[PDB]
Amino acid sequence: FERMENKVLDMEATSQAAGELAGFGIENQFAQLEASSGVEDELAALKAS
Positions that interact with another protein (CB under 8 A)? 1, 3-4, 6-21, 23, 35-36, 38-40, 42-43, 46-47
Q: Report which residue type is found at 42.
A: E
Least distance in Å: CB of 27 to another protein? 14
Least distance in Å: CB of 34 to another protein? 11
DSSP state of 29: T
Least distance in Å: CB of 46 to another protein? 4
Q: Report which residue type is found at 2.
A: E
Backbone phi, psi, residue 29, to 5° = -45, -30
